[PDB]
Design an enzyme around this catalytic site. Structure first.
Site, mmCIF file in Angstrom:
data_model
loop_
_atom_site.group_PDB
_atom_site.id
_atom_site.type_symbol
_atom_site.label_atom_id
_atom_site.label_comp_id
_atom_site.label_asym_id
_atom_site.label_seq_id
_atom_site.Cartn_x
_atom_site.Cartn_y
_atom_site.Cartn_z
ATOM 1 N N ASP A 1 0.789 -1.084 0.138
ATOM 2 C CA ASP A 1 -0.173 -0.119 0.008
ATOM 3 C C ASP A 1 0.765 1.323 0.080
ATOM 4 O O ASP A 1 1.202 1.553 1.050
ATOM 5 C CB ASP A 1 -0.854 0.037 1.189
ATOM 6 C CG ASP A 1 -1.741 1.344 1.217
ATOM 7 O OD1 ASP A 1 -2.073 1.858 0.248
ATOM 8 O OD2 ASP A 1 -2.263 1.490 2.214
ATOM 9 N N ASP B 1 -1.283 5.513 -5.263
ATOM 10 C CA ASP B 1 -1.860 4.879 -4.079
ATOM 11 C C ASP B 1 -2.177 3.122 -4.717
ATOM 12 O O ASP B 1 -3.106 3.013 -5.502
ATOM 13 C CB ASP B 1 -2.940 5.512 -3.611
ATOM 14 C CG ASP B 1 -3.801 4.741 -2.229
ATOM 15 O OD1 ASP B 1 -3.143 3.555 -2.059
ATOM 16 O OD2 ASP B 1 -4.721 5.316 -1.795
HETATM 17 C C1 LIG Z 1 -7.257 -3.753 -1.227
HETATM 18 C C2 LIG Z 1 -8.151 -3.332 -2.556
HETATM 19 N N1 LIG Z 1 -8.648 -1.905 -1.899
HETATM 20 C C3 LIG Z 1 -9.873 -1.498 -2.151
HETATM 21 O O1 LIG Z 1 -10.685 -2.180 -2.434
HETATM 22 C C4 LIG Z 1 -9.755 0.080 -1.849
HETATM 23 C C5 LIG Z 1 -9.186 0.551 -1.030
HETATM 24 C C6 LIG Z 1 -9.230 1.797 -0.422
HETATM 25 C C7 LIG Z 1 -8.559 2.410 0.674
HETATM 26 O O2 LIG Z 1 -8.683 3.345 1.426
HETATM 27 N N2 LIG Z 1 -7.192 2.035 0.520
HETATM 28 C C8 LIG Z 1 -6.159 2.379 1.601
HETATM 29 C C9 LIG Z 1 -5.584 0.923 2.228
HETATM 30 C C10 LIG Z 1 -6.595 -0.021 2.189
HETATM 31 C C11 LIG Z 1 -7.870 -0.035 2.815
HETATM 32 C C12 LIG Z 1 -8.618 -1.071 3.093
HETATM 33 C C13 LIG Z 1 -8.294 -2.555 2.555
HETATM 34 C C14 LIG Z 1 -6.996 -2.500 1.983
HETATM 35 C C15 LIG Z 1 -6.338 -1.538 1.869
HETATM 36 C C16 LIG Z 1 -5.084 3.290 1.398
HETATM 37 O O3 LIG Z 1 -4.277 3.484 2.212
HETATM 38 C C17 LIG Z 1 -5.934 4.646 1.078
HETATM 39 N N3 LIG Z 1 -4.652 5.668 0.630
HETATM 40 C C18 LIG Z 1 -5.220 7.032 1.052
HETATM 41 C C19 LIG Z 1 -6.446 7.585 0.416
HETATM 42 C C20 LIG Z 1 -6.459 9.260 0.740
HETATM 43 C C21 LIG Z 1 -6.641 9.269 2.381
HETATM 44 C C22 LIG Z 1 -7.005 10.452 2.960
HETATM 45 N N4 LIG Z 1 -7.932 11.525 2.157
HETATM 46 C C23 LIG Z 1 -8.313 12.735 2.586
HETATM 47 C C24 LIG Z 1 -9.026 12.611 3.858
HETATM 48 C C25 LIG Z 1 -10.379 12.028 4.065
HETATM 49 C C26 LIG Z 1 -11.019 12.244 5.473
HETATM 50 C C27 LIG Z 1 -10.485 12.396 6.431
HETATM 51 C C28 LIG Z 1 -9.084 12.813 6.492
HETATM 52 C C29 LIG Z 1 -8.410 12.905 5.392
HETATM 53 C C30 LIG Z 1 -7.592 11.327 0.817
HETATM 54 C C31 LIG Z 1 -7.542 10.077 0.265
HETATM 55 C C32 LIG Z 1 -10.389 2.601 -1.263
HETATM 56 C C33 LIG Z 1 -10.974 2.151 -2.005
HETATM 57 N N5 LIG Z 1 -11.972 3.078 -2.867
HETATM 58 C C34 LIG Z 1 -12.543 4.241 -2.137
HETATM 59 S S1 LIG Z 1 -12.114 2.756 -4.485
HETATM 60 C C35 LIG Z 1 -13.836 1.787 -4.768
HETATM 61 O O4 LIG Z 1 -12.447 4.203 -4.986
HETATM 62 O O5 LIG Z 1 -11.135 2.044 -5.083
HETATM 63 C C36 LIG Z 1 -10.926 0.893 -2.461
HETATM 64 C C37 LIG Z 1 -7.437 -3.377 -3.834
HETATM 65 C C38 LIG Z 1 -7.941 -4.126 -4.739
HETATM 66 C C39 LIG Z 1 -7.317 -4.274 -6.283
HETATM 67 C C40 LIG Z 1 -6.064 -3.363 -6.280
HETATM 68 C C41 LIG Z 1 -5.631 -2.727 -5.394
HETATM 69 C C42 LIG Z 1 -6.367 -2.361 -3.909
#
Ligand SMILES: C[C@@H](NC(=O)c1cc(C(=O)N[C@@H](Cc2ccccc2)[C@H](O)CNCCC2CCN(Cc3ccccc3)CC2)cc(N(C)S(C)(=O)=O)c1)c1ccccc1
Length: 374
Positions: free
Chosen positions: A36, A220
């Site tokens: 990640d 990301d």
């Molecule tokens: C593991 C899976 N990831 C997701 O299904 C996924 C994770 C995330 C996600 O949050 N990933 C984080 C890691 C993670 C989370 C959950 C499970 C596995 C991995 C990342 O670390 C996010 N990177 C930071 C994004 C920023 C965060 C802060 N904010 C601002 C903010 C907002 C509110 C409060 C403070 C600051 C801006 C965006 C997001 C999303 N979405 C919203 S989407 C449908 O548009 O693609 C989908 C995956 C599948 C296939 C390829 C790569 C990754």
């Protein structure tokens, strides 16, 4: 090449995240860890969960050191709570070193682990600024670089449909074709970059470039989609619809709420446009562009006779996120030592006989500094 043993060290199960094996503690406990670049905590499941087949057992590790501090990390999707400590960590198909790293032992979670994904933890590869509880908790890669000879660089080849490579300490030339083009890391927190122009099938979206980076743009690997600020998303969809007008799709398809399926092998890739992002280059007024195909932004959803797809460009309120939809087109070099990110056409990217992903340059783009949010 010299990095051959790191090639093909990534896996993914039905496109639910790319993971690498990491071995923690003593005697060894190996777990599958999601790679990640969008966060900065190394955390592993450490208690039973319905979606986990294995977890970290701290009591069995003689080298585990309790930090006596709780930690909570919320993401865009999901959140977990756990307990901080340090332990020995190696990556068996990564560099030939062992480091003492911070590790968050995940004890409770909400919509974080993914059923059937085969990963049991997460490796946050971004910078200390966005680590929890605060920037004093040294991220894994920082520890690796501080404790060992390993150069301050890693590179990712995410192979979509699967697998790929994380090369640690260098670049492997077998993983890309053509030239590498670099964009500055604007600031060391997320891997923040500056997008200076967007095209759909060669047609300029014609928005103020400030809109593309409000309030940041980041690279990301932990986020599936290409996520765009609302104004940009709406303009992008309008242009993609216009470009693909020989076929009609329900409004909800563009919102990711409806899928469309084709008979196996008949998907009309040709009717969908390519999408280009121009990024700030290393020289004044110089840019380059990366271009992806529908094979990148239309994602398969697993009858065996039917190929169903979800449109994976989506809306954000927190700036642009160049997730797997972008990264699967390219070999991406996270050159932390030189504060830059390189892109080259991936040797494994999914394409067809008519089009390929591309990285091209240089172009002339003026006033690129102004594009960034302050
Ligand atoms: C593991 C899976 N990831 C997701 O299904 C996924 C994770 C995330 C996600 O949050 N990933 C984080 C890691 C993670 C989370 C959950 C499970 C596995 C991995 C990342 O670390 C996010 N990177 C930071 C994004 C920023 C965060 C802060 N904010 C601002 C903010 C907002 C509110 C409060 C403070 C600051 C801006 C965006 C997001 C999303 N979405 C919203 S989407 C449908 O548009 O693609 C989908 C995956 C599948 C296939 C390829 C790569 C990754």
């Amino acid at each position: 090449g010299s990095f051959v043993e790191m090639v093909d060290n990534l896996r993914g199960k039905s496109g639910q995240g790319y993971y690498v094996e990491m071995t923690v503690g003593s005697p060894p406990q190996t777990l599958n860890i999601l790679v990640d670049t969008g966060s900065s905590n190394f955390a592993v499941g450490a208690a039973p969960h319905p979606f986990l087949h294995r977890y970290y057992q701290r009591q069995l590790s003689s080298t585990y050191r309790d930090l006596r501090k709780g930690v909570y990390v919320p993401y865009t999707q999901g959140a977990w709570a756990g307990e901080l400590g340090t332990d020995l960590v190696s990556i068996p198909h990564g560099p030939n070193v062992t480091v003492r790293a911070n590790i968050a032992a995940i004890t409770e979670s909400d919509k974080f682990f993914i059923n059937g994904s085969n990963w049991e933890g997460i490796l946050g590869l971004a910078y200390a600024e966005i680590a929890r509880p605060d920037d004093s908790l040294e991220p894994f890669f920082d520890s690796l670089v501080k404790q060992t000879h390993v150069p301050n660089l890693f590179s990712l080849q995410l192979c979509g449909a699967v697998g790929g490579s994380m090369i640690i300490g260098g670049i492997d030339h077998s993983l890309y074709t053509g030239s590498l083009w670099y964009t500055p890391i604007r600031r060391e927190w997320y891997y923040e970059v500056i997008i200076v122009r967007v095209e759909i099938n060669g047609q300029d979206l014609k928005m103020d470039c400030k809109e593309y980076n409000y309030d940041k743009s980041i690279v990301d690997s932990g986020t599936t989609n290409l996520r765009l600020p609302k104004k940009v998303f709406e303009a992008a969809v309008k242009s993609i619809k216009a470009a693909s007008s020989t076929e009609k799709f329900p409004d909800g398809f563009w919102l990711g709420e409806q899928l469309v399926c084709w008979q196996a092998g008949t998907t009309p890739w040709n009717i969908f446009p390519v999408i280009s992002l121009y990024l700030m280059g290393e020289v004044t007024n110089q840019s380059f562009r990366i271009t992806i195909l529908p094979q990148q932004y239309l994602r398969p959803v697993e009858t065996s006779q039917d190929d169903c797809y979800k449109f994976a460009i989506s809306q954000s309120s927190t700036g642009t996120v160049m997730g797997a939809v972008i990264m699967e087109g390219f070999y991406v070099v996270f050159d932390r030592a030189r504060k830059r990110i390189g892109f080259a056409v991936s040797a494994c990217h999914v394409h067809d006989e008519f089009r390929t992903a591309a990285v091209e340059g240089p172009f002339v783009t003026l006033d690129m500094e102004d594009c960034g949010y302050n």
